[PDB]
C-alpha cells in the first residue's frame, strides 16, 4: 500500500518576504521538488512524469504556477485584512495526495503555525475541531468560489489516483529494488549494546538481540534513519548486566537476504 504525498511549505516573514517550497513523495521515495526559485517543477526520478503525456503534464504544470502565485497574494491579503488576531511571522504547511488499495482515498490538510486547522472534504473546505474561530468567514468566502473548489475536486477525485497508478507502473524498477543491510556491533556505558544495521531497502526489517532460541524482550529498537542514497539505517540496543553480555547475538532479517539472516556474535 502506497501513500502519494505532495507537501507544501510556505513562509511569510513580512509583507514583501515570502517563499513557497514543495516536495512530492511516493511512499518513501522523492519524485518531485519545487523551489520558490524555479519556474517549473523538477523531476527527481527518471519516471516522475508517470504515464501522463507531455501535454497532459505541461497543462498541469501551468495550473500550479497559477496556484503558487495566487496562494501567496491571497494569504498576504488575508493578513492585511486580519489583525490583531494574526501577525507575522507566519508558517503554512499543506499536505495533499492519495492512499492506494487493490480503490483509493484522497486527502487535503492545511496546518497553520504547526497546528492542523483546515481540510478539504468532498465538495468544500472545512475548519477542523479546535481551529481558530476567525477562520470561519475566510473559509465561507473560499467556498463561494466554485472554480477553486472545482479544481481541487478534480485534482483529488480524478488526477491524483490516475497520476499515482502511472508512477506505480513507471517506477516499478525503483520501488521493488532490494538492498542488503550491512551490520556491526558496538557498546557504550549506560553497559549498553548497540546493533547497527545500515543500507537496507525496502523499509521493513526485523532486528533483535538473541541468546539462542530466545529473543531478548529488552531490545530497544531506534528510529529509522535515512541514508544519503535512499537506503535505511536502524539501530537496536539492550542494556546488559556485568557478565550478561557474553553469549549474546544480533540477528537481522530482511527481504534482501532471503533466508540468509545476518547473525553477529558478541
Amino acid at each position, epitope marked *: 500500500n502506497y501513500t502519494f504525498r505532495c507537501l507544501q511549505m510556505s513562509s511569510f516573514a513580512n509583507r514583501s518576504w515570502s517563499r513557497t517550497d514543495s516536495v512530492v513523495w511516493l511512499g518513501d521515495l522523492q519524485t518531485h521538488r519545487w523551489s520558490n526559485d524555479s519556474a517549473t517543477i523538477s523531476f527527481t526520478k527518471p519516471w516522475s512524469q508517470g504515464k501522463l503525456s507531455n501535454q*497532459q503534464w505541461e*497543462k*498541469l504544470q*501551468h*495550473m500550479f504556477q*497559477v496556484y503558487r502565485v495566487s496562494f501567496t497574494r491571497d494569504i498576504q491579503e488575508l493578513v492585511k485584512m486580519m489583525s490583531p488576531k494574526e501577525d507575522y511571522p507566519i508558517e503554512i504547511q499543506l499536505s495533499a495526495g492519495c492512499e492506494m488499495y487493490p480503490a483509493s482515498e484522497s486527502f487535503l490538510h492545511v496546518a497553520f503555525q504547526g497546528k492542523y486547522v483546515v481540510r478539504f472534504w468532498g*465538495t468544500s473546505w472545512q475548519t477542523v475541531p479546535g481551529a481558530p474561530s476567525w477562520l470561519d468567514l475566510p473559509i465561507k468566502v473560499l467556498n463561494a468560489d*466554485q*472554480g*477553486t473548489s*472545482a*479544481t481541487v*475536486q*478534480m485534482l483529488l477525485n*480524478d*488526477t491524483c489516483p*490516475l497520476f499515482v497508478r502511472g508512477l506505480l507502473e513507471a517506477g516499478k524498477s525503483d520501488l521493488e529494488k532490494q538492498e542488503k543491510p550491512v551490520a556491526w556491533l558496538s557498546s557504550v556505558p549506560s553497559r549498553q549494546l548497540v546493533c547497527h544495521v545500515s543500507g537496507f531497502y525496502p523499509k521493513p526489517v526485523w532486528v533483535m538481540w538473541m541468546r539462542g532460541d530466545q529473543e531478548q524482550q529488552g531490545t530497544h529498537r531506534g528510529d529509522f534513519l535515512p541514508n544519503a542514497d535512499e537506503t535505511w539505517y536502524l539501530q537496536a540496543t539492550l542494556d546488559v548486566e556485568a557478565g550478561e553480555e557474553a553469549g549474546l547475538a544480533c540477528r537481522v532479517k530482511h527481504s534482501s537476504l532471503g533466508g540468509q539472516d545476518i547473525i553477529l556474535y558478541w
Partner: T-cell receptor
Amino acid sequence: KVQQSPESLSVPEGGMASLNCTSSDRNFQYFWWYRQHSGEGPKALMSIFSDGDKKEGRFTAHLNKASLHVSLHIRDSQPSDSALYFCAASEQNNYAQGLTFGLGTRVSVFP
Amino acid sequence: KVLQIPSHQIIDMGQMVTLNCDPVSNHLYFYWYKQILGQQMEFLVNFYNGKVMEKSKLFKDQFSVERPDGSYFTLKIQPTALEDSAVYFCASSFWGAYAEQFFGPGTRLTVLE
C-alpha cells in the same frame, strides 16, 4: 459533439423551461450551461460535475454521470429569460481547455 | 469585465485586420471564439502566458495570436478571406479548466469584395 434538446422551447411567463444535454464520451462528464442574448457575449449560467441536483436561485440542474445526461430547469420563467442556451462538456483530467458548445437552444418566453 | 474595442469593423479583401482584446486583470488563460450569422459559437485558439496551446481546425494557416507585455491580446487575420466576415469573441478564464470563461462583447467583422 454534445447533443442538445430541443431545437426550440416555448414557455409562458411563470412556467418552467426544461432543456436536455448528452455527452457521448465517458471522459466528458463535466458540464456547463452558457446563456447568450442576441448579438451579445455568452455568460456562464452554471456548472455541474457532480451526480446530484444543483439549485442556483431560479435554476435547477440534474446530472447523471452514469448515463452522461444533464438537464437545465428554468422555473418561474421571466420574460428576460428568452435567449440562446448553450451546453458543453469538459474533459476529465485536462486543466487547460476550450468550452466546446452544442447547437444551443432558443427559448421563447411569452406573456 | 473583459473589454473588446472596436466593435464594428469593415475591411477590404487582401489587407490584414487586427482584433484587439483587453482581458480581465489576474487572468492568464485567453481564448478566441467565432460566430457567423449569429448561429454557432466556435472555439479557435487558447493562449497562456507566452505561447499558444490548442489551435482548432478552424484556426486558419493565415492567423496569428500574439500577446506582448504591456499591450493587448490580438488575433491577426493576415489576409483575409470573404469567409472571415463574422463575429469574434475574446475570453478570459483564470483557471485553465472547470471554471467560468468570461466573454467579450465581440467584434463584428465584415470582409467585402
